[PDB]
Amino acid sequence: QFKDLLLDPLTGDLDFGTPGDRGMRLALTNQLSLRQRLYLRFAIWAGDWYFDETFGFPYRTFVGKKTVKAVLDGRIKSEVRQEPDVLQITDFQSTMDVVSRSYKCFFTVVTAEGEEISLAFVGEDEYQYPTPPESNVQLCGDEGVIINFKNKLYYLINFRLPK
Amino acid sequence: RTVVRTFDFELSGYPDETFRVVLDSVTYELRFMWNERDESWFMSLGDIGAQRPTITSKLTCYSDILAPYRYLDNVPDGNLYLWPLGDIRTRAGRFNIGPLKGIQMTYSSLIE
Amino acid sequence: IGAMAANDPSYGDSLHLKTMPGMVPFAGSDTQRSNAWSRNANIYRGLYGGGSYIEGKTSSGQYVDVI
Amino acid sequence: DADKAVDQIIEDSKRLHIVVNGTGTEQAVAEDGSLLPSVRKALIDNLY
Amino acid sequence: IALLSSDADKAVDQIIEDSKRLHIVVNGTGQAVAEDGSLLPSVRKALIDNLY
Amino acid sequence: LKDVNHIHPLPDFVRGGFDYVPSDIFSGKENFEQTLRILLERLEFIDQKMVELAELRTTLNAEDAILDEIGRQLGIYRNGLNDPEYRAVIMILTGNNSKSGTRADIIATLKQLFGEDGVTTYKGYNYRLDINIFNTCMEVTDILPEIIDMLPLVTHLRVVENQGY
């Protein structure tokens, strides 16, 4: 439920929205929040962000060196579980090509969805305060009491005659 | 009647919270009970170790809780109010009470 | 199908008392349920404090997990 | 314009009244033109 | 002015249920429940349970 | 999406509690159910009357037998007024406490007594004011004393009442 500015999954810029409803949006669904929380966590190289030297991933250790596939998978699979709301990891297809020296892995992560605790900070309210009456209706009655009775009588006259 | 803000409250949401607070250099004990059907907080105020609470009332927004009770030697003379930080239409809830949860329960003391 | 798919056949997992989301309890009386049971027509039943399937018996008679 | 509803109510009451008190047999006429039987007409079935 | 109708509904609804019971009894099939909780068999059912 | 007033009869009170029978152990025994139902259904009546004890005490629906108590707290005694208009005077006097007797204001108070189009007001050069009534639903002579009270200190007033235009 971690709120934050929404990042476009397709381009990487802020998700200002479609041309018909351009604006700014907050990440509300846990899925969207977790997506960007993993994306930033994996995209920032370790130590390259000032104000926090411990954040990021240490790509320099592996890239450019002769490395064992098994060691890399452990670190990749470990960084994911640093988020407190990750249920499990389903599958992991780690493959390496020696000709091009490229490495490419696949996997998915499962996360549940929570409640909103309070709507005070977001948009709307859930209550239905009453509406003041109109004109002399309060002190003298209402005509609808006649209309509903007339309709009931008419429908009952309709019911008895077979159709 | 000049008054200055001097204390703020927070609630963890437990239905039977009870704790001691100090106001205007005097000390009091407070009890908060959650009502299911009426979805509202019931507050009881009394002296430390008192047999029975001195005041019991229902909490609501923008209502002076202590108004009719500033005639007793053991009741604070300040002002106790609940007002929201977010949209003005939000009413007091269970978990939405606190300095940043949405509702600001506050006590303010007159200047003497 | 949602209760049997992701389950290897070698475990012999019976379908007796599993819960099926979406289904609605069978409201027939005791005599009706006994009748349907002889038909090998399984029923989803609202049980004591809950609701669950009854039996995985096929039309021939053998339990489904065997098949 | 509640006079309009009061109008229909006025004769609906009369139709109902004749149906309840339709002697041994009365045939109340509805606005649709169908025919409604008095209670005692409906009671011929038991009357054998 | 004519808002005495605030009493008429407690009779109008009641006659609705009475008409419903009338219909089920007369046009029923081989029952009806009164406010007393006792049963009234429909004619097409009463014709079956009587002494033959 | 939800009503703010939580004071309502509890929906389906009876079937609740029966839901707390552990595992249908007694259900279908027709001997324990009746004993439990007989006791629970008594609370139904008490639960229902808890509302009217609060609903009926409001000034809008208060009956004359107790409306007098509401009026007594405010100093508005019955005198010779009857129930339908005694309610009106209570509203009129109470509403007077936040008024200034302006032309727009006066129309608002008369609005609650004669519907939307039942009243009109002419104005005159030398303190003259006129009130017109078209759809009165109550006798006006007994209400008249209040109709004077919410007017400026120097008003000159005429009152004419008729049915329709």
- Is residue E19 within 8 Å of A160, Cβ to Cβ? yes
Token pair belonging to A151: 């309709």
The torsion angle over the Cα atoms of residues E3, E7, E8 and E13, rounded to 10 degrees, is 140
Beta carbons within 10 angstroms of residue E51's beta carbon: 3
Beta carbons within 10 angstroms of residue F83's beta carbon: 13
Q: What is the C-alpha separation between A121 and B34, in angstroms, rounded? A: 23
Q: Residues near A132 by Cβ (< 8 Å), separated by ≥ 6?
A: none
- Is residue F94 within 8 Å of F71, Cβ to Cβ? no
Chain A nearest CA to F1, separation (Å): 5
Q: What is the C-alpha separation between A49 and F133, in angstroms, rounded? A: 80
> Which of F6, F8, F50, F51 is the best substitution to test chain B (most B C-beta atoms within 10 A)?
F6
Geometric angle at alpha carbon B92, from B89 and B97, rounded to 5°: 120
Q: What is the C-alpha separation between C61 and E38, in angstroms, rounded? A: 45
Q: What is the C-alpha separation between C61 and C41, in angstroms, rounded? A: 10
DSSP secondary structure of D11-35: HHHHHHHHHHT--S--EEE-TTS-E
The torsion angle over the Cα atoms of residues A73, A78, A83 and A89, rounded to 10 degrees, is 50
- Is residue F134 within 8 Å of F164, Cβ to Cβ? yes
> CB–CB of B90 and A117 under 8 A?
no
Contacts of residues B88-91 at CB distance under 8 Å and 24 or more positions apart, as own/partner, are B89/A125, B89/A127, B90/A119, B90/A120, B90/A125, B91/A127, B91/B61, B91/F4
Q: Half-sphere exposure of D46 toward its Cβ, with a 13 Å CA cutoff? A: 15
Which residue has 């996360």 as its token pair? A111
Q: What is the C-alpha separation between C2 and F103, in angstroms, rounded? A: 73
DSSP secondary structure of F24-48: SSSTT-SSHHHHHHHHHHHHHHHHH
> CB–CB of A139 and F87 under 8 A?
yes
Burial of E40 (0-12, 13-18, 19+ CB in 10 A): middle
> Which of A116, A128, A140, A143 is the best substitution to test chain F (most F C-beta atoms within 10 A)?
A140
> Which of A137, A150, A159, A161 is the best substitution to test chain E (most E C-beta atoms within 10 A)?
A159
Cα–Cα distances (Å) from F164 to B12, F122, F137, in that order, read 64, 17, 12
**In chain F, which residue's Cα lies nearest the Cα of C51?**
F23
Encode burial over B64-94: b for 16+ CB neighbours within 10 A, e otherwise. Answer: ebbeeeeeeeebbebbbbbebbbeeebbbbe
Q: Is B39 on the interface with F (CB under 8 A)?
A: yes
Q: What is the C-alpha separation between A82 and A39, in angstroms, rounded? A: 13
Strands B3-8 and B103-110: antiparallel
Token pair belonging to E37: 């909780």
> Which of B40, B60, B88, B90 is the best substitution to test chain A (most A C-beta atoms within 10 A)?
B90
The values of phi and psi at residue B82, to 5°, are -125, 120
Chain D nearest CA to A130, separation (Å): 26
- Is residue B92 within 8 Å of B11, Cβ to Cβ? no
Beta carbons within 10 angstroms of residue F117's beta carbon: 10
**In chain B, which residue's Cα lies nearest the Cα of A117?**
B95
Q: What is the C-alpha separation between F140 and F88, in angstroms, rounded? A: 11
For chain D, what is the radius of gyration of the CA atoms?
A: 13
Strands B26-35 and B40-46: antiparallel
Geometric angle at alpha carbon F8, from F3 and F13, rounded to 5°: 120
DSSP secondary structure of C1-61: -TTTSSS-GGG----SS---TT-------HHHHHHHHHTT----EEETTEEE----B-SSS
Q: What is the C-alpha separation between A155 and A140, in angstroms, rounded? A: 27
- Is residue B100 within 8 Å of B94, Cβ to Cβ? no
Helix H or strand E segment including F65: helix F64-74
Which residue has 């139904």 as its token pair? F44
Q: Do F and A count as touching (3 or more CB pairs closer than 8 A)?
A: yes
Range 5-44 of D in CB contact (< 8 A) with E: 6, 16, 39, 42
Q: Is F4 on the interface with B (CB under 8 A)?
A: yes
Q: What is the C-alpha separation between A149 and D2, in angstroms, rounded? A: 11
Token pair belonging to B39: 């979805």
Encode burial over E6-25: b for 16+ CB neighbours within 10 A, e otherwise. Answer: eebeeeeeeeeeeeeebbeb
Strands F128-133 and F119-123: antiparallel
Q: Which chains touch E (3 or more CB pairs under 8 A)?
A: A, D
Cα–Cα distances (Å) from E40 to B11, D44, E49, in that order, read 61, 17, 12
Cα–Cα distances (Å) from F91 to F70, F97, F112, F148, in that order, read 11, 11, 9, 15
Which residue has 């998978």 as its token pair? A73
Measured between beta carbons, the chain D residues lying within 8 angstroms of E2 are 6
> CB–CB of A160 and D36 under 8 A?
yes
Q: Residues near B31 by Cβ (< 8 Å), separated by ≥ 6?
A: B16, B17, B18, B43, B44, B53
Chain B nearest CA to F40, separation (Å): 19
For residue F89, the one-letter residue type is V
Q: What is the C-alpha separation between E7 and F100, in angstroms, rounded? A: 41
> CB–CB of B90 and A120 under 8 A?
yes
